[PDB]
């Protein structure tokens, strides 16, 4: 399965919460954004995160999301 | 009044790469950092000592096997330098964990 743990989903929340201007529908830049904008300890955990914070981003465009 | 190019070979061997590469790149710079003539670190295949054993002290149970391993990392850097720098470069640059070997010779 590919269900993202809370730590990923939690962190994505926190970042969209306070950096919606900046951030994009693009993972590739959301990646780089995460580096400047947050400390993470492993490349894997970062993309795992930024990929999902892109997901959440990509569908706020099409209506609100609880949380 | 002394000196003379002696054609040297430093071999570095260890199990801890950060220290090993500490002493490695430290050496290479601190040689061209005053203009010698070398062939940069040659990393030989890192080699792996395995030991494969049953965990049990006795015999009971499904037979769980378990492999310990020890990695050996060996480098060598070739230097052409006078008698002085050699010893200066051998005595210091030492490090708990890295084994330095200096040989000379045409062959």
């Amino acid at each position: 399965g590919r269900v993202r743990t809370k730590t990923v989903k939690r962190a994505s929340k926190a970042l969209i919460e306070r950096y919606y201007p900046k951030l994009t529908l693009d993972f590739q830049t959301n990646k780089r954004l995460c580096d400047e904008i947050a400390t993470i300890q492993s490349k894997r955990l970062r993309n795992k995160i930024a990929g999902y914070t892109t997901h959440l981003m990509k569908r706020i465009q099409k209506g609100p999301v609880r949380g | 009044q002394q000196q003379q190019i002696i054609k040297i070979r430093i071999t570095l061997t260890s199990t801890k790469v950060k220290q090993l590469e500490n002493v490695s790149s430290n050496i290479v710079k601190n040689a061209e950092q005053h203009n010698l003539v070398k062939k940069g670190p040659v990393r030989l295949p890192t080699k792996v000592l395995k030991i494969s054993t049953r965990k049990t002290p006795n015999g009971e149970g499904s037979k769980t096997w378990e492999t310990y391993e020890m990695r050996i990392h060996k480098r060598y850097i070739d230097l052409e330098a006078p008698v002085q720098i050699v010893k200066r470069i051998t005595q210091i640059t030492i490090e708990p964990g890295v084994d330095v070997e200096v040989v000379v010779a045409s062959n």
Binding site: R18, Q41, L45 | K47
Partner: protein
């Protein structure tokens, strides 16, 4: 000499291992806590990290002399090619082995089981630990064997940070009715690591945004 590199590195480990043993036996009542062996030209150097280094020494050098001689005569060194140096440790309170051997000692002056361990926890904690945990297994006074957990603060138990952050030690305290085992587990604050990762692989710090006063119709400043 003339030894295969393979043989030589394995060789060296065993050496550390026999050495470490020997000291752990000889220097228990001085809080021996580990060694390191620095090989140099002209000398093999052995630093003894023990907590009570005045005793490790002896009257103007008595005991470390004996020890060297000992260390020397065994591995067949040449009087001078071997060198011993004691050296107190920065805070024993974050050294597994230190606290195991403390209990051993505590329990041998016969403190109440819980009183022993519970203080050992509450000192490690005091010594700035990010978590600690003690097990006592074996038999006391009753016949049937028991076991206890004594733990406080934060530990983690899996994967690489284990290698990184938790120190452990088992020691076997030998008593009259039987022999019981101590297990100490200190975990050090990763925020201070000095040389490694400075946090759990789990840590995800988000930087706090600055509040800005936007608006203001264009404008431009000359320099």
């Amino acid at each position: 000499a003339l030894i295969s590199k393979k043989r030589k590195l394995v060789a060296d480990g065993v050496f550390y291992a026999e050495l470490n043993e020997f000291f752990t036996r000889e220097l228990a009542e001085e809080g021996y806590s580990g060694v390191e062996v620095r090989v140099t030209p002209t000398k093999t150097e052995v630093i003894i990290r023990a907590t009570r280094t005045q005793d490790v020494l002896g009257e103007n050098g008595r005991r470390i002399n004996e020890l060297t001689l000992l260390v020397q005569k065994r591995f067949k060194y040449a009087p001078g090619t071997i060198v011993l140096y004691a050296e107190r440790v920065q805070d024993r309170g974050l050294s597994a082995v230190a606290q195991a051997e403390s209990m051993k000692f505590k329990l041998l002056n016969g403190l109440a089981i819980r009183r022993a361990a519970y203080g050992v926890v509450r000192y490690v904690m005091e010594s700035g630990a990010k978590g600690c945990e003690v097990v006592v297994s074996g038999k006391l006074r009753a016949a049937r064997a028991k076991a206890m957990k004594f733990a406080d603060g934060f530990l983690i138990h899996s994967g690489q940070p284990v290698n990184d952050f938790i120190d452990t030690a088992t020691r076997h305290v030998l008593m009259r009715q039987g022999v019981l085992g101590i297990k100490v587990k200190i975990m050090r604050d990763p925020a201070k690591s000095r040389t490694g990762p400075k946090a759990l692989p789990d840590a995800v710090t988000i930087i706090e945004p600055k509040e800005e006063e936007p608006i203001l119709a264009p404008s431009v400043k000359d320099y």
